[PDB]
């Protein structure tokens, strides 16, 4: 669970990269289809799947909406992800491995984007709330 | 992979007890229930609204016998597991879109129902050679995904 | 999150399975450090770790208990797990990722041992509960 | 592992460019602030009660130097990467009784900083080969325990 000291963490790094979303977003599923190929069964039903593709740009908008929504839900993350996790698990039926493979990837361009704001505090507590934010998108799944 | 005497003829056992039409059923059948999301592939195979559903489902336990007659030719040479499952591989990946990591899943329900089957049988030295022989075969499947 | 339905499946399991805790425990740790020796880096304070042993015996007595205490305290984990939680976070120091490896046992053992018992239902729900009992377990760890 | 020509040179081109005493250092201290768990082995290091502490200790800087040089063994011969590190799998098993699990998340943090130190230039090709590299020592150094 989030102790007010990873809650702090979390919206104090948001406060940081949130005005860069949209590149997060594009960055970390681009890496995501790249070296985690497998991921793009879920997108079979697009043109095409290819990193920075307008596909991938506009999907990345969604997820970080999505991660920004939990950001502002942090004290609960379940109730507040509801929508995303019907939507996850009865229509996309995606399998919650791909979560952790996503979180690793968003994590990865944090870095390489916010060196400085990436500290290994902001590392722990951002990572905790991602598989938080991870195992709520799983709530409804089964 | 270097297979041991014990681990190949632990394999040949287990699958020369195993009745498909019932294992292979049973498998798939719990894997649905377990892990719902693996349900994603199969839209026209009728009502999966339920685990009793899914247990009276006649398409559900067809596939389950076919995935389990599929891994005979990994048994037949278990030093070839790679390239007998290469086409496998590029089927499930570019005609069937099935996310991988559904093997692994599938492989541990088939643990669980071969478990159940053969009981104090399926000792820790047994689920070692099982799981390692599982584990070749899941990576195989995934081989081709690009 | 385990709903109602899956609360009245683990009590019921329990309630038919909980007559066999010390087989099921002394089973599960030996399958463990048989299938998984890594593991067995946590048990380096014995003289030696093989299964079915004296010592072996006694910690599944152990779990099994942890894993009891979970059932009565199925309705919050977190809470009823706190000691554990401290216990396996500052003074063992358990990598998480075993708590995945024995949560695979122990479903083995019980399907072993209870196969008309450990129907698909019954074994989504102790699956869900394991997972909450393993991030209950972690809740101390960062 | 087959690895592609662009996989050996830029595993080569990373290594060539990480300054070891501070990339050693920053990464074991990082693995050690986000796993906690791995603080387990460095009991005589003193102080690890806070990342600030943690990145005071000159020990874990000393340590985190020291599994950095570590690699440089693979990277000359990335071939041969098992054989290379049978060794220390069996002192990181039977004398360090370290888990080897943290092999991987000492490996993830390591990415993390690598991630920070090169920024834009680490594209997810870049991503792609670092990161099988490292899951191939990984592998060496875990698969000695028995
Ligand atoms: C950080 C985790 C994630 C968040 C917060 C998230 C969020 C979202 C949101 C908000 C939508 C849009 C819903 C709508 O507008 O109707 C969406 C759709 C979708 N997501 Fe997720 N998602 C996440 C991870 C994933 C992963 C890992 C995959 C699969 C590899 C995935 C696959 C999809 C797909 C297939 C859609 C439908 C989009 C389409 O049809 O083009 N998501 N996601
Ligand atoms: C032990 C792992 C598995 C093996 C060895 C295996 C084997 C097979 C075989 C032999 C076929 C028939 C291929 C052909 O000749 O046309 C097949 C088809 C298929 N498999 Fe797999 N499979 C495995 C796991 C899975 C999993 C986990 C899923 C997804 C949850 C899956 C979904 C499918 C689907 C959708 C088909 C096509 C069914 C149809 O439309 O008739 N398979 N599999
Ligand atoms: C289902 C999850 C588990 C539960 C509920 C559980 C429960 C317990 C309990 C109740 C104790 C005794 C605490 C005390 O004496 O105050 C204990 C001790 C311990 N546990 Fe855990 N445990 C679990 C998983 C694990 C795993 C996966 C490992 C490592 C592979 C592990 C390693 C240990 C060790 C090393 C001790 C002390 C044993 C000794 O020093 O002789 N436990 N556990
Ligand atoms: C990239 C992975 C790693 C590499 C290449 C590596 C490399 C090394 C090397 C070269 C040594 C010195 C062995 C000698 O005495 O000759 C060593 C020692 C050691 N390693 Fe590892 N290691 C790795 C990861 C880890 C991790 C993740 C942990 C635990 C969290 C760990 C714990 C230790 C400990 C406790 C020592 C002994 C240090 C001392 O004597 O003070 N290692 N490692």
């Given at each position: 669970s989030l102790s007010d000291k990873d809650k702090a963490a979390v919206r104090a790094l948001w406060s940081k990269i949130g005005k860069?979303?949209?590149?997060?977003?594009?960055?970390?599923?681009?890496?995501?289809?790249?070296?985690?190929?497998?991921?793009?069964?879920?997108?079979?039903?697009?043109?095409?799947?290819?990193?920075?593709?307008?596909?991938?740009?506009?999907?990345?908008?969604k997820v970080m909406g999505g991660?920004?929504?939990?950001?502002?839900?942090?004290?609960?993350?379940?109730?507040?992800?509801?929508?995303?996790?019907e939507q996850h698990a009865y229509?996309?039926?995606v399998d919650p491995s791909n979560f952790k493979i996503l979180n690793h990837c968003i994590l990865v361009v944090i870095s390489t984007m916010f060196?400085?704001?990436?500290?290994?505090?902001?590392?722990?507590?951002?990572?905790?709330?991602?598989?938080?934010?991870?195992?709520?998108?799983?709530?409804?799944?089964? | 992979v270097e297979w041991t005497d014990f681990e190949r003829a632990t394999i040949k056992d287990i699958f020369s007890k195993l009745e498909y039409d019932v294992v292979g059923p049973a498998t798939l059948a719990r894997c649905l229930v377990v892990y719902p999301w693996?349900?994603?592939?199969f839209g026209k195979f009728g009502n999966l609204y339920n685990a009793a559903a899914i247990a009276q489902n006649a398409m559900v336990s067809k596939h389950?016998?076919?995935?389990?007659?599929?891994?005979?030719?990994?048994?037949?040479?278990?030093?070839?597991?790679?390239?007998?499952?290469?086409?496998?591989?590029?089927?499930?990946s570019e005609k069937l879109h099935?996310?991988?990591?559904?093997?692994?899943?599938?492989?541990?329900?088939?643990?669980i129902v071969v478990?159940?089957?053969?009981?104090?049988?399926?000792?820790?030295?047994?689920?070692?050679?099982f799981q390692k022989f599982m584990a070749v075969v899941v990576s195989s499947l995934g081989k081709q995904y690009r």
């Open positions: 860069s979303s949209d590149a997060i977003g594009n960055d970390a599923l681009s890496r995501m289809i790249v070296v985690y190929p497998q991921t793009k069964i879920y997108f079979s039903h697009w043109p095409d799947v290819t990193p920075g593709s307008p596909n991938i740009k506009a999907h990345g908008k991660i920004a929504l939990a950001v502002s839900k942090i004290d609960d993350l379940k109730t507040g992800l509801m929508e995303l996790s229509k996309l039926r060196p400085k704001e990436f500290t290994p505090e902001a590392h722990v507590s951002l990572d905790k709330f991602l598989s938080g934010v991870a195992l709520a998108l799983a709530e409804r799944y089964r | 693996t349900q994603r592939y389950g016998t076919t995935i389990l007659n599929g891994l005979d030719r990994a048994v037949k040479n278990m030093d070839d597991i790679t390239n007998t499952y290469a086409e496998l591989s590029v089927l499930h099935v996310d991988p990591d559904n093997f692994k899943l599938l492989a541990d329900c088939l643990t478990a159940a089957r053969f009981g104090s049988a399926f000792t820790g030295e047994v689920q070692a050679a």
